Amino acid sequence: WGNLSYADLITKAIESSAEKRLTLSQIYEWMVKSVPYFKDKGDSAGWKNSIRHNLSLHSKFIRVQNEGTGKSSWWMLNPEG
Amino acid sequence: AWGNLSYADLITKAIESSAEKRLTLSQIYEWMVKSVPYFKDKGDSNSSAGWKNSIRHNLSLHSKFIRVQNEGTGKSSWWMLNPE
DNA sequence: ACCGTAAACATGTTTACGGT
DNA sequence: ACCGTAAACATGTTTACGGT
């Protein structure tokens, strides 16, 4: 596929969430459900490595501790960045 | 071979030894290597893979240890004691 | 310089097992 | 029941490289 970039797909996923925040697990399902090229890829390697790479690298994504036991962090858009 | 103290006991004494009563996982490794003689000669990630895995397992298994988001660039979380 | 892809490496989380 | 040990899997963080 082409279209937008990995950093743009994560942003479009976050903007659709009511609380303006999504865990890494939630981003995976949104990509499978919203992007047709990932529709058959709901099973950790490849494009899932690229998503984690983009979240830690780009300053426009911040990591927020989750208020749920055993749950991964919240990923939201950086206000300043 | 370090005594009758458990891993949770060793992690607790390390955390209690800090002024802020909180340490990162990397710092817990340093106290074990620096304070416990049995761990003094196993600082490299070859002889350490064993006990370093046991420490992360103890921090995540027992409710006594809690995780707090760090306040740095990409620093790992703080590990403190559960108020319970 | 940016992006996608790959890989090493660190940090957390659970599940399982044998010994005391 | 508790502990130590080992291991699978997930989640985060860096570094490198070819192509545009």
From Swiss-Prot, chain A:
Highest taxon listed in the record's lineage: Eukaryota
Residue list for modification Phosphoserine: 50, 56, 72-73
Tissue specificity remark: Expressed in umbilical endothelial cells (at protein level). Abundantly expressed in skeletal muscle and ovary, with lower expression in the heart, placenta, lung, liver, pancreas, spleen, testis and small intestine. Weakly expressed in the brain, thymus, prostate and mucosal lining of the colon.
Record-annotated site: DNA-binding: 6, 63
Known DNA-binding region: 1-73
Induction record: Expression is regulated by KRIT1. Levels of expression also regulated by FOXC1 which binds to a conserved element in the FOXO1 promoter.
Post-translational modification: Phosphorylation by NLK promotes nuclear export and inhibits the transcriptional activity. Ubiquitinated by SKP2. Ubiquitination leads to proteasomal degradation.
Subcellular location: Cytoplasm; Nucleus
DNA-binding: region residues: 49-56, 72-75
Function noted in UniProt: Transcription factor that is the main target of insulin signaling and regulates metabolic homeostasis in response to oxidative stress. Binds to the insulin response element (IRE) with consensus sequence 5'-TT[G/A]TTTTG-3' and the related Daf-16 family binding element (DBE) with consensus sequence 5'-TT[G/A]TTTAC-3'. Activity suppressed by insulin. Main regulator of redox balance and osteoblast numbers and controls bone mass. Orchestrates the endocrine function of the skeleton in regulating glucose metabolism.
Quaternary structure annotation from Swiss-Prot or TrEMBL: Interacts with LRPPRC. Interacts (acetylated form) with PPARG. Interacts with XBP1 isoform 2; this interaction is direct and leads to FOXO1 ubiquitination and degradation via the proteasome pathway. Interacts with NLK.
Disease: Rhabdomyosarcoma 2: A form of rhabdomyosarcoma, a highly malignant tumor of striated muscle derived from primitive mesenchymal cells and exhibiting differentiation along rhabdomyoblastic lines. Rhabdomyosarcoma is one of the most frequently occurring soft tissue sarcomas and the most common in children. It occurs in four forms: alveolar, pleomorphic, embryonal and botryoidal rhabdomyosarcomas.
Protein name: Forkhead box protein O1
Gene: FOXO1
Residues of the full protein shown: 160 to 243 of 655
